[PDB]
A paper describes a structure:
The primary function of bR is that of a light-driven proton pump, where trans to cis isomerization of a covalently bound retinal chromophore starts a series of conformational changes necessary for directional transport against a concentration gradient. Structurally, bR shares the seven trans-membrane α-helical topologies typical for other rhodopsins, as well as G protein-coupled receptors. The primary reaction from the bR dark state to the K-intermediate is the isomerization of retinal from the all-trans conformation to a twisted 13-cis conformation that stores a significant part of the initial photoenergy. Here, we investigate the effects of increasing laser power density on the light-driven proton pump bacteriorhodopsin with a focus on the K-intermediate that accumulates just after the excited retinal chromophore returns to the electronic ground state.
The thermal load can be followed over time when analyzing the atomic B-factor difference between light and dark datasets collected at 10 ps, 100 ps, 1 ns, and 10 ns delays excited at 1281 GW/cm2. The relative B-factor difference on the counterion cluster and retinal continually decays before disappearing after 10 ns where the heat is nearly evenly distributed throughout the crystal as evident from the maximally expanded unit cell.
Numbering used by the authors: 4 to 234
The structure:
């Protein structure tokens, strides 16, 4: 375990996702409003899944070796299993906040599946140049998601309760900034051009993950927007 220099960041990420899970679980104890229950369920599941996958990387299960560029490169595949389930859950939190139509939700979740699935194929591809073909397709899927969040969701939120509009705007801005950093880290890190070493890459993903899951959830679950309008 400690033989890998990045272990300290995997351990800290495990601890922070675990603590985030427990906090959201206790905070949601006793909430009875059915609308608020939806948001607590979605938002608590996100760090719980990430906890299990950080733990699997810490213990060494979620790591494989991929040959490319004449070397055996360590690839943490467990990240993609986490993101496959947690990134559509985070998009569902945003879509439910603005009462998105069903067709738009399907488009978002489908594009997200394509983004993570092609990222995984790129991470495991043995022909070096082809890794960047998959990165470009995945990045195009991400740009579709970001477009919808700005030129689809923002338009509907502005016609809803003011507390829904303001909370959405903040969570939208947090999401766009944090999610856009992931393709950059991948491209310059061990999966891509290899300019940043794996230990620093692991630190960067851990800061992004904790911010995009526990930070996001703290903003959402402290908002009055998750409760129905009632007397
Ligand atoms: C919110 C409060 C928390 C604030 C925290 C946010 C900081 C996020 C971390 C960033 C990257 C820093 C990585 C450290 C730099 C290591 C690079 C290095 O030293 O490599 C030298 C090499 O030997 C010769 O080039
Ligand atoms: C050190 C602590 C480690 C961290 C803990 C280990 C994580 C894996 C454990 C459990 C799944 C528990 C349930 C996860 C689902 C929670 C959903 C929820 O809370 O739903 C609220 C809603 O209001 C209901 O109607
Ligand atoms: C609303 C959506 C609900 C979503 C709830 C789903 C959460 C499941 C999470 C985690 C366990 C990780 C499972 C990862 C499976 C890896 C098994 C595998 O393929 O291993 C192959 C072997 O290691 C050859 O290398
Ligand atoms: C493997 C990746 C895919 C599986 C991972 C799970 C990701 C989240 C699940 C589903 C989106 C499907 C559409 C669900 C949107 C329905 C929300 C809605 O419009 O409201 C319906 C409700 O009946 C009103 O009361
Ligand atoms: C819209 C928000 C999301 C946008 C996300 C897409 C951004 C893509 C950016 C840049 C490509 C820059 C490529 C630079 C890579 C050159 C690496 C190289 O070969 O240089 C070797 C090294 O510099 C010698 O030490
Ligand atoms: C909880 C973790 C989050 C919000 C992770 C988000 C991940 C991404 C937006 C990943 C994007 C990628 C690309 C657009 C191309 C290169 C490969 C990925 C998967 C890193």
């Amino acid at each position: 375990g400690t033989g890998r220099p990045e272990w300290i960041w995997l351990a800290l990420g495990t601890a922070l996702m675990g603590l985030g899970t427990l906090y959201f679980l206790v905070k949601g104890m006793g909430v009875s409003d059915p609308d608020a229950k939806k948001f607590y369920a979605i938002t608590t599941l996100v760090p719980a899944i990430a906890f299990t996958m950080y733990l699997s990387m810490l213990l060494g299960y979620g790591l494989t070796m991929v040959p490319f560029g004449g070397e055996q490169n360590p690839i943490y595949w467990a990240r993609y299993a986490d993101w496959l389930f947690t990134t559509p859950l985070l998009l569902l939190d945003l879509a439910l906040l603005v009462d998105a139509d069903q067709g738009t939700i399907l488009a978002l979740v489908g594009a997200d599946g394509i983004m993570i699935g092609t990222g995984l194929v790129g991470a495991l591809t043995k022909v070096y140049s082809y890794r960047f073909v998959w990165w470009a397709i995945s990045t195009a899927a991400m740009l579709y998601i970001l477009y919808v969040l700005f030129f689809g969701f923002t338009s509907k939120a502005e016609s809803m309760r003011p507390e829904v509009a303001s909370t959405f705007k903040v969570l939208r801005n947090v999401t766009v900034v944090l999610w856009s950093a992931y393709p950059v880290v991948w491209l310059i890190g061990s999966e891509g051009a290899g300019i940043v070493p794996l230990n620093i890459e692991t630190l960067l993903f851990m800061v992004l993950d904790v911010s995009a899951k526990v930070g996001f959830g703290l903003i959402l679950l402290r908002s009055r927007a998750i409760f129905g309008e009632a007397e």
